[PDB]
């Protein structure tokens, strides 16, 4: 791609969620959703391989179906209430279809079957763009209508999201699929805390984003697609294993890392609203998430997997690849827990 279409595509990718967040109209949040989808599709099919085409096709058909369901809900609300916003008395069926389609857009379970496959087959920076940027707009639409949604449907969607995400991330080996089921579990946490306190939903979203960014940067340092590929990182870049361990433990929610704070304050608010059984099941599935994180840590940092012979030449070569804001996001995603009252509102 030449810089003209690079700038246009990145500007529309930026602009979609910005229109969705800045917009007070259901129609404009919709059109921002397909700015995001349409602008990001050439970026998935940038590599021009059958796997990228497969991911782009599945992603397109999923988002198209969900966007048509969203527009159905918008049109039905427009007939029922004469306005372009779910104000207070729109139909619960309409609100549930809206929640259905936004959960389909997000890729949380049981609508999660496309997210690991779409995350696979695309480059790592597009996995980062998807799993971080493409979720703010559906979260924005969900946050705008928090008192109207159905707590039962949200709680079911959330608990099965964490269940399927924990089990998948336990299952596979591929880094992109691991990050995708990690995203599914984290979106389950955000969705569960959505109807009671959207501020904690935003806090969990920012914590997940600042944890997902240095994962993907560290993967892009060596294009480590595999558990083995990140396992020989000690020969390639040994000065990163400590932060890999700290940020993966933060993703697991282990104190005193700052990734414990979203799960902790979410459990605290859920128990303020008396859903103890739900909170316990969520925390146990978070322990499963921490299990596959700990296996990944064992593979990459605490043990030293055998290496190759060309790694000598790769160490002979130099590198200027790792960017400056990797360390800033890494430190903010590891050592921010004593600033918890400042992080929460």
């Amino acid at each position: 791609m030449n810089p003209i279409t690079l700038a246009i595509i990145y500007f529309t990718i930026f602009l979609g969620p910005v229109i969705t967040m800045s917009s007070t109209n259901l129609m404009l949040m919709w059109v921002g959703l397909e700015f995001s989808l349409l602008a990001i599709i050439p970026m998935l099919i940038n590599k021009k391989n059958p796997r990228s085409t497969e991911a782009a096709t599945k992603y397109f058909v999923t988002q198209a179906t969900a966007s048509m369901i969203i527009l159905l809900a918008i049109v039905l609300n427009y007939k029922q209430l004469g306005t372009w916003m779910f104000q207070q008395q729109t139909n619960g069926l309409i609100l549930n279809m809206t929640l259905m389609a936004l959960s389909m857009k997000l890729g949380l379970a049981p609508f999660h079957f496309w997210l690991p496959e779409v995350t696979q087959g695309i480059p790592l920076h597009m996995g980062l763009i998807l799993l971080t940027w493409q979720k703010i707009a559906p979260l924005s639409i969900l946050i705008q209508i928090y008192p109207l949604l159905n707590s039962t449907i949200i709680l079911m969607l959330a608990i099965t999201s964490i269940f399927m995400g924990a089990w998948g991330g336990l299952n596979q080996t591929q880094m992109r699929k691991i990050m995708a089921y990690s995203s599914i579990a984290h979106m389950g946490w955000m969705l569960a805390i959505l109807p009671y306190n959207p501020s904690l939903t935003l806090l969990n979203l920012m914590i997940y984003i600042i944890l997902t960014a240095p994962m993907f940067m560290a993967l892009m340092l060596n294009n480590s697609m595999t558990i083995n590929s990140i396992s020989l990182l000690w020969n390639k870049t040994p000065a990163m294993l400590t932060m890999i361990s700290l940020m993966l433990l933060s993703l697991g929610g282990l104190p005193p890392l700052t990734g414990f704070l979203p799960k902790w304050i979410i459990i605290t608010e859920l128990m303020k609203n008396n859903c103890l059984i739900m909170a316990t099941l969520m925390a146990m599935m978070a322990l499963l998430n921490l299990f596959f994180y700990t296996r990944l840590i064992y593979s990459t940092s605490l043990t030293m997997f055998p290496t190759n012979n060309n790694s000598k030449m790769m160490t002979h070569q130099t590198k200027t690849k790792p960017n400056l804001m990797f360390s800033t996001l890494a430190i903010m995603s590891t050592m921010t827990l004593p600033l918890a009252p400042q992080l929460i509102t």
């Binding site: 030293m304 030449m313 130099t318 690849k321």
Partner: protein
């Protein structure tokens, strides 16, 4: 200023800096047949940068101080040991082959970066497109195994189509008895311990497999020794050579820019040569890797990034 998208926007166009002599020329031949001298003369009288054969210590000579490092840092594979005993149980043969392919890949990346940055043509000796010849020769001689062949083919499939084929491939056809006579006359005692079966395997791999895949996508210039041993007719053919086939015609400025980024980042170049395929020939254990990596780190000038090593005279470290 480091090359990038900003430099491409401000104007660093490869097609703007191209000229007639901006060509990739590769000289190929058997073990001892006039390959070095002809490439040097062609580059000298065409105004082109000559790249000799990438040996074991190519990365050592191109990185750091440029002195050859120890063998355990540079591949831990000996061509002399391979000539003395090619069927050794430690896997010296396939380690040497993979290390030489990695060296040739680094040399091809350097030559491509030089051509895309300065516009000067390059004359390489035995680039990556004619190293599977040595691979298949050792496989047919039984020196390596089918798993090594599959791993080499996988690495070649991973790395090879990302770059551009050479504009011209000049080949030196030479008989095996002539190669044997030249090897005996050279006087390297390890090098006389090579088999005519191995040399015939190299020549057969050339004739049957390397020349056609060059032939449908670039210009092939097979010559004898007597057609060679005079670097004027070959240069005349290079002058009267028309490049009307291959993917070089379809390249434009932004494809050149992305290829320039790929060849200017050496880690992406050698990314797929270190895939976690655990052949016992090339797999190195954690303890040996730890010791070798550590000793390479207290090697002088290699502890930190270049320009940050105070022991070699780098200044303003605190200020940068």
């Amino acid at each position: 200023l480091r090359y990038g998208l900003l430099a491409a926007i401000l104007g660093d166009k490869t097609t703007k800096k191209l000229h007639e002599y901006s060509r990739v020329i590769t000289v190929d031949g058997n073990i001892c047949s006039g390959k070095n001298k002809l490439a040097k003369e062609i580059a000298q009288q065409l105004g082109m940068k000559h790249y000799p054969e990438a040996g074991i210590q190519y990365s050592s000579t191109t990185t750091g101080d440029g002195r050859p490092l120890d063998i355990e840092f540079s591949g831990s594979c000996s061509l002399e040991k391979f000539y003395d005993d090619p069927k050794s149980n430690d896997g010296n043969s396939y380690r040497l082959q993979s290390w030489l392919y990695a060296s040739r890949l680094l040399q091809y990346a350097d030559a491509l970066e030089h051509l895309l940055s300065t516009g000067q043509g390059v004359v390489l000796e035995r680039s990556i497109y004619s190293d599977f010849v040595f691979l298949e020769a050792m496989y047919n001689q039984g020196y390596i195994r089918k798993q090594c062949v599959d791993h080499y083919n996988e690495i070649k499939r991973l790395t090879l189509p990302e770059y551009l084929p050479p504009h011209a491939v000049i080949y030196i056809d030479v008989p095996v008895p002539e190669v044997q006579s030249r090897i005996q006359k050279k006087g390297d005692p390890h090098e006389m311990k090579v088999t005519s079966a191995y040399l015939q395997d190299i020549e057969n791999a050339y004739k049957k497999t390397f020349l056609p895949k060059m032939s449908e996508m670039c210009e092939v210039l097979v010559y004898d020794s007597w057609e060679a041993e005079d670097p004027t007719k070959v240069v005349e053919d290079i002058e009267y050579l028309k490049y009307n086939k291959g993917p070089w015609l379809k390249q434009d400025d932004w494809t050149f820019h992305y290829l320039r980024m790929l060849v200017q980042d050496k880690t992406e170049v050698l990314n797929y040569t270190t895939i976690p395929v655990y052949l016992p020939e090339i797999t190195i254990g954690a303890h040996q890797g730890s010791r070798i990596y550590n000793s390479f780190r207290e090697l002088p000038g290699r502890k930190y990034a270049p320009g940050y090593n105070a022991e070699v005279g780098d200044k303003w470290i605190w200020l940068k």
